[PDB]
Each structure stands twice: as structure tokens, then as C-alpha cells.
RNA sequence: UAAUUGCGAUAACGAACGAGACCUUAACCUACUAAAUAGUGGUGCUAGCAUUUGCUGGUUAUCCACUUCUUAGAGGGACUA
RNA sequence: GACGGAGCCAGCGAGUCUAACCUUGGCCGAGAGGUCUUGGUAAUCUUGUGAAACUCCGUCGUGCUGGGGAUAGAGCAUUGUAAUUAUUGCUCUUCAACGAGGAAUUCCUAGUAAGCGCAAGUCAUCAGCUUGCGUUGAUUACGUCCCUGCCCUUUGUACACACC
């Protein structure tokens, strides 16, 4: 009786949407997905190599639903972290804009996000629809 | 205090003589009673106006109109 | 039981338990008594608390720490050393895990275990300093009950810290086994070892 | 129509604006259920008001909280106030004084002040030290 | 062991060179007329219960 | 009949206040809608520097503050009335700017 | 601590000296009285005047004072 | 006249008490806890009345409250220079009078619920209509106006309403509002004055002050009758309407007196505990019921209570 | 007493600077004035799911209403009641 | 506890006119950064400064180890007329002491200490610095004159550049 991604938990929903995007597979990932560190503030590549890009896609799709319009700068600021500069103190350094834009335009070529005026990217019709249906199946996953 | 920032005017002047320069510090505290704007007194004076007295018994009566 | 179902879930487990009795997470706050005298009115186990994180002002006046419930004091003493000065949400998880381990090791009430541990490791007789020209002496002096409770909690947490600095065992396990042995003093707790050395040095220096 | 009241809850920098209206009985923060806020162990801290007084007294109220400023603990301790003051304000404005009063007795019997906010504010930092009271280490030698 | 449960009546003064040891007048919770002075290390109010294992030292000012 | 915006600012609060009182007074005896003034956040110009002219002594710092107060009012008035407001209301220190749009 | 200074003491003594019948036993009424019959320039100072004036009123009702 | 149970719910000195003639089961209390609480009476051994509604909206202490006869319009005069008119149900402000330059002392509505009068600290009395038009401004008092009280005229709602007022320059003024001039002035008070009230028939004034003498004046013949020491600071004054008595809340307790003939009725003492003899809680407010069977007394320990007229034995 | 801060005593009396008072800031105001350069609610248009009312959103010339939160200005409040 | 994912929240402020500042958004690039535009003389735009510590789920595992990141080599960029005794930034590789610190000694009584980052200042570029700000937020006193000193009174003095 009324379902939303706000009404479903975050981690669970993100795992289930990552598993759905794994089961579909139409994401056309770039060739350098194993190379990258996802930020210059990292030092090791992501551990779960087979699904880190799809988890990033799930998180970005949820973010676009939650907000009005954001860009690659906002995504890099969010997915950045603390850079270990050695003996010097930590700083906040932005994430990898290349993989952020690759996952953004991959969600575009699926049809989940599109170009929003005054700049930006906003959630689509079928994108809001399929995020809401998988929010449903995560709500009624109870036995 | 802010009373010094309100009422006191200070001036500094360098005077050149045949020896080294002389420093004149002039400080003038204005009276409060002849001020035209702002407070008229220092924030310490509690000036109390005197009352007037009336006879108590008064022969209690009424007036007709 | 009369549950009221809304479109917001409000699950039945928290519904039933915390409508019936004002608990911990799921732990009864009644039927706990301080087994010994001289620590009542200070070991605050008469007013219940959901979660030890409270924004209560206790350091303003003189004995509001005595008015404070004891589990928050356990978290606040789990808090020390400069790596972890600030992370009392983390300290609350450690404490929840510790009391879970207490329940697994022994079926009795974990708050009763904490009370018994504090009671059995409060150092009854300390030793103070006297000028004493020459060897600069020490004289045995008894301990006020709030200082008993404070030194008890400090001994427990320092023992857990140093026994789980570089080990496989985690802070929750080390604190739980120290609390178990302090509840049953078996000459194995660092807290009761420091208590015993304090008592023997006091009875020597008196 | 829409018999609603607006209340607030503050901690150090968090402002939580609670809209409290007569409805079906739902309780939501930032468009999401209370059962989904993420301070992890402070899920019970939010429930504290709802629980203490009793779910019954909320079985006819819709409250929606919009939250700004301050870190996560500041966020949660503010919801607590709003879903308790909005409660106290609603029972003031619409129902019996004995009911509002006995809610006040329960709240002040158990309180982490709840209805009143904390007057503790971050004092300003002074020169000669990285902290507000602590000063730089001097050497003498 | 001769454990003794005392109960304060009065606070006399804060002795000790560094000023941390407080003098108290205590009774013993079985005789009303049996009262002595004690040195205490911690903070002490009126109406609290102290623990002694030895009750006849009768100490005085610390230097 | 033109809809314009008048924005005043200064550093001295009291003369800014009676400038604004004069403006709202004159608009109120010649009403246009009501347009009470809107009060912006005060801009605190903070400049911190050392007390010492040389580099000797205890390290004592000082913070000078300038306070910028800024208000705006909307008017929808004809030509000569816009004028007579803008040349009659004028005091030292308060800088007032008028914009057509 | 809360020791009151010569300004508030001297002022309150003058007020209770020359305004006894009009002045009351309540702080709120007494501070409205002080606001109306004294041209004091500070709000906190006025509150201090009224508080010490109320203290002297209670002591006068209790018994005769030397001041 | 025995205690019928104590009444709590406030955190300030209970400055004003009032009732409703149309609905005699209702009480309104205005106190120094910055709120006005309306209560429904029950008649219980202890809790004589239960609070049913609490009204807020002031930024300072409220001093006076006045009701219309049936109990639908309620005015309050509060020391944030505010007058405000509530209803009784659902608690919303019908209107707010502002315009007074200082604290407001007393408000009164006429018998036909059309004329509202407010005397206040800026040495003046505003008279307003119901909607919020300042009908007139009246001066004359060189000092604090203590209180105002309306006086209704003869039957069939004759084309005049009278008013009386007391001000702290030893002055009492009786005015008529048909074309706004002065008609009577009363002198004779030894000291400060705080409280007067007017007869239910509308021709007697009783007035009272600091040192315990009560004067009574008559407007029909415009003459003074007498004066009567209470030996203490009298605070509040009330008329027992049908039975025609004089209740006076004073600094030690209650003094209720009789008019026909001149005899003291009762020096009413409340039992207290825990207080020394030098800190006895005095009186603040009195009110009589619609038919005057009950006087409610509000006291400085945030406590109202009630004593009902009953045969002495 | 934080304080030659006061009570008092008194060959001293009456004063002055300093302290305090003062000023700024942080706290309270569902009391005033307001405000698409801060918001909120409703109304239109529109998107999902549920559809049975609803829930989550978006929307500048869609207006309307308000100032609780945000800003200020004028005040109030604590004076150890 | 390190790492890897996700969750995800501040406040103080600064910013271009005859200049070229803060930069959104789109695209290229592993990254740093580059390019095409846009908004802002500023409660409007940068900016909800989506900060970090934290929270959750996972990898590791008492191993100087995935702790630690000094010292080195190679390359790619930016600022600048000019970077060679590396301006800085990024990438890969090298992976040292350090296993909680002796005599001593500093600061601190509540939103304080401590942890955590951010803004501004100097600034073409360069923070491990300072000045402010917010986030998370303990313990232990509520005293004493023992050490170090301070104020008042009395007292002694062969001191007055005054106990050096
Ligand atoms: Mg991250
Ligand atoms: Mg660090
Ligand atoms: Mg700090
Ligand atoms: Mg809409
Ligand atoms: Mg991490
Ligand atoms: Mg912000
Ligand atoms: Mg490493
Ligand atoms: Mg810089
Ligand atoms: Mg350089
Ligand atoms: Mg430098
Ligand atoms: Mg000698
Ligand atoms: Mg000599
Ligand atoms: Mg020598």
C-alpha cells in the first residue's frame, strides 16, 4: 500500500538493484574498469571487481532519484574521500570523473537518466518506474 | 568602557624640534549634560526626582457637579 | 497485546517489548539489586535507559555523575586513549556486544554482572600522601563510595584496554571476560589484582 | 481544514521542522519512515517519545519532519524533540489539559530534557591555542 | 573478616597537604552513641555508607 | 507607472535605520502596495592581524570588524515620485542605489 | 559572587528613602516603578536596582534597619 | 465557609479569576506563568475543577481577564502592552488590541457586549469597540491608573453606560461615554490604591488600597458613606452579588465583611505547612460565582482554592 | 566578595581612576514588523506506485495564504526570583 | 585497526572592470589536469561548500604484516619570463626507523580536553603554520597552599644597580 525508494532501506535496495543490473547486463562498461582506483584519494582498486561498477550504477541511480539534478562534479565530490598524503594531514579529494561520467552515460543509454536544463542530469520516466518496482520487490521480499 | 568610546576624544601629534620628535597626547572628556545626541549621562548616575506631599486627613468629602 | 498497525511498519518486537516494560535493547531492568551495601544511591540502576547515548549534563554540579546511570559511565570509560576520543557511538556498540557475550557466557542479567563486578572490584582502602621529611610517606585512608565506583570502572576499562591492545581477541570479548571474572573474583581480573595490591599496600603502609 | 501545527527541535546546529496534522497516523522523517533513519543504534532514541507515551496517542496523527544542519547525532536528537514537542503542542491545542499534563509528567520523569533544548553552545576559540581553552605548549628552554 | 559499614553524620574539614583528604564524623550503623573521626580520600556528602576493615586508628591532621 | 527596486546599505546601524524609516514612511503616505522593507543578513567584514608592529612579545592577535547592513524596498511608482524619493531621502554614509528592473 | 556594588546600593537607598509609600513588595511592579521614576540608562542595572530595593523592602517589613 | 479542595495547574501568582453567567460551571484563571487556563468544575473532595483549556500568546505577564456574560468572548490584559480577545472553544485569537504605550491594567466589556474599556500604565484609558477601532482616549490621572470597572445603567438598556476608575495619584474618576466627558471625581484616600469594584445594581463603589481602609461611594446621590481598616495590605476586592457582601483579599489572608448591618463576618485563614512565620504566602485574586455561592481565591504558591457559602452551623 | 566588592569599625571627611557598571557575541521569544535574494502549506499542471481517499516527487511568472523554522530591526526576559 | 565498497551530515567565510576571480554544467583524460559554455559585484551563483572523523556490509589478520610511508628511480601535467639544489599535483616502482618512548616537562574543569576536517591570511604556484569555524565528544576536582608563584597585614634586615 504505497512503495518508494525512500520507504525501502538503502544498503538492501542497493544490493538488490546491483544484482538486477548484473542479471540484465546491458551496461556497456569501459575497458579500464580493472585499472582504476575510483579516486586519486584511494590506493587500492575495488575488491569486488565483478560488481563494483554495477553497485556504482545503483548508487548513482538512487542519487538521481533522491535529488533534482546533479552533475559529474557533484558525483565526484560525493564519491571522493580522504587522501593519505604521507606524513602530511589528510584532505578531501574528488573521485574519478571518467568512471563517474561513464556510469552516468551508461545509465543514459539504458534510459534511466537524461539531460536536465539549466545544466544537469535528472531521473527518467522508465527509470523512476523501474526503481520503484524494484523498491517494491525489496519491500515484499519478506517470507 | 563604551563611555570612553562615547565621550572621550583623543588626539596624537608629532612635533618636530631640533632634537628627536616629541609626542603630544591630548585627551578631552566631554561633559554629558550638554550633549545634543546620544546619552545625556554616564551609565552610573541614578538621578532621583523629588516627590510632593499632601496632607493626610483632608476632611474626607465629595464634590458636586 | 493489542498491536496497532499503520502503513509505517513499527515492528512487532520493539512494539511489544518496549510497550510492556521499559527495557534496554531487549533486557529487563527490574529484578536487579545491589548485592552489597555501601554502593547504593551511587550505582544508578533504578532509572532505566534505552541506549547509553544521552546528552545529559553531568559535569556541571558536584554529583550529577553519581545521578548518571552506570551503563553510560561504562561507555564513557570505554572511550579513552587518543585513537578513540570521541567515538561513543562505537563505544555503545562495543558495550552492546559485550553484554551480548555476557548473556552467552552466563544466563544471568548482564547489568547484574556489571553491578557485581563494580561491587567486587571497588578498592576498599587506598593510600594517600604525607609530606613526612625524609622518605615522604604514605598513609592508609578509606575510600568514599563514589570514588570506589569510579576507580572500579576505570580499573575494568584499563584492564580491557591493555589485555586487548595487540591480540586476536576484540574489546568486547576482553571486557566481557574481565567482567565475568570480576563478578566472580578468581584472582584473574586485572581489576581485582589492582584492588588486591591496593589493599595489601594499604595494610602494609598503615 | 488541515488542522496542522508546526514545531521545531534544535540541538547544536540541527533544525528539525515537524509538521503535525490530524491524519491516519504515520510518522516520517525526510520523506522516509522513522524505521529507516541511519544513526544505527539510535533507532531507539527516535522511538523514545513514540514509545514512552504510547503508540495509541499517535494512531491518528501524521507527522513529517524536514531536517537541516548539524551532524548525524545532532540530526537524531532533534527529531526526538520535534516528535515530542510537536506532540506536546498538538495535545495543547486540540485535546485535554490532563492528557497534555500527564504527558509532561512522563517526559520530565524520564527526560533528557527532551521538550527543552540544551543551552550548551560551542564557545569561541582564542589565539595562542588550537582549542577554545587549551593553549600551545610552551618550552621555557 | 571484620568488615564494618559506617555511616557519616558530619564533615569536619579537608586536611592533607595537597588538600584531598577529608575529615568526617561517622557512626557505625549499630550503635548511635559510637562515633569516631575518619580520613577519607574521595568526595563525601552527608548520609552515605563507608567501608572499614579496621575501625580504631583515630588519625589526625596530615602533613 | 514603473516597478523598480531601491537598495540601501551602510555601516552605521542607527542612521541606516532612520533612512529606512524615512523611506517606509514616505512610501506609506504614498502607498503602492505596502512593501515593508526586507532585511538581509549582516555582512561581517572580519580582518585579523597582529598587535605588534615588530615581531616581539606575547603572540596577541586582534580582530577588527566592519558591519555591512543592507536593505531593499520595492516601489511601483511614476517618474517624478521615483525622483523626489531618490533626491529627498539622503544622509551621510548610507549608500542608496536604484535599479529599474 | 553576587555582591552588589556602591552604585546599586546608593541608588536603591535613595529610592527607598524618598519613595517609600509608592514602592511595592514585588520585583516586577518595583522595576516598573524604577523605570518610571528613575532615568536610568541600563536595563540590567535597572533590574539590579529593583532587586536590591525589594530586598530592602522585605528587611524594612521585618524590622528597623540602621541605614 | 470551609475549604472545598485545592486547585493547581499554574506556575505564577494567580492575578485574575473570572466566571461565566451563562455557563456557571466554568472558571478562567490568569496567572504569572504567562498563560490563561480555563477550567471545568466537578465538585470533587479535592480536585474541585479540572483544567480543560490553556491559552497562550503573550510575551509577558498577564494581569487581568474579563468575560462576557454567556461565556463566548474573553479578553485578557497583559504587561506586554497587549489586549487580546479569545473564544472559549478551539482557542484562537479573535482579535488583538495594541496601541497602549505601557502595561495594561484593566479591561471591561459592557453588558450588551459592544464597548470594551482598558485602563493602563501610560496614565490613560483607551476605549475601543469590538472590531478594533480606538473610540476615544481619556486622561486625567497624573500617576498609575490602578483599575477600571464598568457600571451598567437602568433597565431596558437605557442610552447611557457609566464607568469608574482608580488611579494612584489618590484619584477616582467616574465617567460617562455618551459624548466622552467627566462627571464625578472622588478624593479622600490616605495612601496608594489598588482595587475597586461596583455594585450589581450599579450605584455603589467600594475601593481599597495599601493601609486597610475601605471607602464606599454612591453615584445616585453622589455621596461618601464610610471607611474600614483591615490592618493590612488589601489586594483584591469583590462583591457577593445576591447576598450583598464585601470580600477583601489581603496580605495575610481573606477578610469578608457584611454591609447589612456593619459587622465583620470572617477573617479567613488557610492552613499552610513548611513555611516560617515571616514568609506567609499572601493573597492575590478573588472572584465570585454567577449567583455568588462560591468565591475562588488565587494565592502566591501558584494555588487557587474555593470556599462555598454555607450556614455557619 | 572574583574584586580597597561590600557590611561595618573608625582622626578622619568628601572624592577620583581602576574593578564593576559599559559594549559585542552565544543562548530564549510559536509575542510585533516584515520578506520569490529565506522558507512553509495549499491550489493548479505533471511523474511513479497504489489505486479507496493516499505516499514520495518536480514545476517560475501556476497563483493564494502564512512567518513555525531563516534573517534582521524594535523590544521583552534573570534581578541570583 | 588498515583497506574496499556503499550510507551520508556542518558552520565561519571569500570571489572579476577595464580585470581577468569563485566556478556550475557538457565533453576528453587512469589521474593530475585540459577544453566548450554558464551563473555570480553576490542570503540570489560557485555552494545543501553532499568536509572528514563516523554508520553498515565485506577483505585482512598479531606477521614490522594489507601497520608505517620516510629515502630513492622513471614518466605525465599545472603555475610562472624562468622550476636545475626535485615549486607543487598525479602514476608506477623502491618500502627505512618506529614494537607506546629515560631523566624531565606542557596544556586542561565542560559542549571543556582530545579526535576530525573546512574556510580565511600570507598567495602566480606552494601548509605539515596561524586566525576562525563547525562535527564527534570522555575521565577526574568542585579542593589545597606541599612544589611554582601572586595579593594584603605584621615582623627582621648590615639590601636600594634592592637576594642574581
Ligand atoms: Mg566514500
Ligand atoms: Mg589522523
Ligand atoms: Mg578542538
Ligand atoms: Mg505543487
Ligand atoms: Mg572506510
Ligand atoms: Mg550550509
Ligand atoms: Mg598502508
Ligand atoms: Mg591558503
Ligand atoms: Mg616558496
Ligand atoms: Mg608563517
Ligand atoms: Mg633579625
Ligand atoms: Mg645601601
Ligand atoms: Mg646568594
GROMACS .gro file of C-alpha atoms in nm, chain D residues 16-129:
model
  114
  430UNK     CA    1   1.410   1.981   1.260
  431UNK     CA    2   1.080   2.131   1.143
  432UNK     CA    3   0.790   1.898   1.221
  433UNK     CA    4   0.451   1.934   1.052
  434UNK     CA    5   0.194   1.765   1.279
  435UNK     CA    6  -0.155   1.714   1.140
  436UNK     CA    7  -0.467   1.506   1.200
  437UNK     CA    8  -0.445   1.207   0.969
  438UNK     CA    9  -0.419   0.832   0.953
  439UNK     CA   10  -0.127   0.804   1.196
  440UNK     CA   11   0.205   0.797   1.010
  441UNK     CA   12   0.543   0.925   1.127
  442UNK     CA   13   0.808   1.016   0.870
  443UNK     CA   14   1.143   1.197   0.851
  444UNK     CA   15   1.277   1.343   0.523
  445UNK     CA   16   1.005   1.160   0.331
  446UNK     CA   17   1.112   0.825   0.481
  447UNK     CA   18   0.977   0.617   0.777
  448UNK     CA   19   1.127   0.652   1.126
  449UNK     CA   20   1.217   0.283   1.097
  450UNK     CA   21   1.474   0.381   0.833
  451UNK     CA   22   1.683   0.664   0.982
  452UNK     CA   23   2.052   0.575   0.989
  453UNK     CA   24   2.223   0.655   1.329
  454UNK     CA   25   2.216   0.266   1.363
  455UNK     CA   26   2.184   0.228   1.745
  456UNK     CA   27   1.981   0.548   1.795
  457UNK     CA   28   1.677   0.396   1.627
  458UNK     CA   29   1.552   0.352   1.983
  459UNK     CA   30   1.645   0.713   2.061
  460UNK     CA   31   1.394   0.833   1.798
  461UNK     CA   32   1.133   0.581   1.911
  462UNK     CA   33   1.175   0.703   2.275
  463UNK     CA   34   0.887   0.958   2.251
  464UNK     CA   35   0.651   0.746   2.037
  465UNK     CA   36   0.718   0.456   2.274
  466UNK     CA   37   0.707   0.627   2.619
  467UNK     CA   38   0.367   0.798   2.580
  468UNK     CA   39   0.229   0.504   2.378
  469UNK     CA   40   0.156   0.430   2.010
  470UNK     CA   41  -0.213   0.486   2.081
  471UNK     CA   42  -0.172   0.863   2.105
  472UNK     CA   43  -0.016   0.868   1.756
  473UNK     CA   44  -0.276   0.636   1.593
  474UNK     CA   45  -0.443   0.943   1.448
  475UNK     CA   46  -0.153   1.179   1.367
  476UNK     CA   47   0.059   1.235   1.056
  477UNK     CA   48   0.395   1.399   1.127
  478UNK     CA   49   0.652   1.488   0.861
  479UNK     CA   50   0.994   1.622   0.961
  480UNK     CA   51   1.228   1.828   0.741
  481UNK     CA   52   1.583   1.841   0.872
  482UNK     CA   53   1.869   2.086   0.817
  483UNK     CA   54   2.220   2.138   0.951
  484UNK     CA   55   2.440   1.964   1.207
  485UNK     CA   56   2.595   1.617   1.208
  486UNK     CA   57   2.414   1.285   1.242
  487UNK     CA   58   2.379   1.280   1.623
  488UNK     CA   59   2.257   1.640   1.605
  489UNK     CA   60   2.004   1.522   1.343
  490UNK     CA   61   1.861   1.240   1.553
  491UNK     CA   62   1.844   1.425   1.887
  492UNK     CA   63   1.647   1.694   1.704
  493UNK     CA   64   1.386   1.454   1.566
  494UNK     CA   65   1.336   1.337   1.923
  495UNK     CA   66   1.241   1.689   2.027
  496UNK     CA   67   1.018   1.763   1.729
  497UNK     CA   68   0.820   1.436   1.752
  498UNK     CA   69   0.775   1.513   2.123
  499UNK     CA   70   0.715   1.889   2.117
  500UNK     CA   71   0.501   1.865   1.811
  501UNK     CA   72   0.323   1.608   2.023
  502UNK     CA   73   0.301   1.835   2.326
  503UNK     CA   74   0.187   2.130   2.111
  504UNK     CA   75  -0.082   1.920   1.941
  505UNK     CA   76  -0.220   1.796   2.274
  506UNK     CA   77  -0.208   2.156   2.398
  507UNK     CA   78  -0.401   2.297   2.104
  508UNK     CA   79  -0.659   2.023   2.048
  509UNK     CA   80  -0.714   1.788   2.345
  510UNK     CA   81  -0.747   1.780   2.723
  511UNK     CA   82  -0.514   1.955   2.966
  512UNK     CA   83  -0.491   1.648   3.192
  513UNK     CA   84  -0.368   1.445   2.894
  514UNK     CA   85  -0.107   1.704   2.796
  515UNK     CA   86  -0.006   1.741   3.161
  516UNK     CA   87   0.042   1.367   3.227
  517UNK     CA   88   0.249   1.353   2.910
  518UNK     CA   89   0.459   1.634   3.057
  519UNK     CA   90   0.494   1.437   3.384
  520UNK     CA   91   0.616   1.129   3.195
  521UNK     CA   92   0.852   1.339   2.981
  522UNK     CA   93   1.007   1.520   3.277
  523UNK     CA   94   1.021   1.200   3.482
  524UNK     CA   95   1.231   1.024   3.218
  525UNK     CA   96   1.368   1.327   3.036
  526UNK     CA   97   1.698   1.402   2.876
  527UNK     CA   98   1.513   1.736   2.898
  528UNK     CA   99   1.351   1.647   2.560
  529UNK     CA  100   1.091   1.924   2.545
  530UNK     CA  101   1.361   2.186   2.641
  531UNK     CA  102   1.683   2.210   2.433
  532UNK     CA  103   2.042   2.210   2.551
  533UNK     CA  104   2.187   2.552   2.631
  534UNK     CA  105   2.540   2.421   2.572
  535UNK     CA  106   2.692   2.609   2.278
  536UNK     CA  107   3.042   2.583   2.127
  537UNK     CA  108   3.247   2.862   2.281
  538UNK     CA  109   3.475   3.065   2.052
  539UNK     CA  110   3.840   2.976   2.001
  540UNK     CA  111   4.113   3.203   2.137
  541UNK     CA  112   4.450   3.288   1.989
  542UNK     CA  113   4.755   3.113   2.128
  543UNK     CA  114   4.585   2.774   2.126
   0.00000   0.00000   0.00000
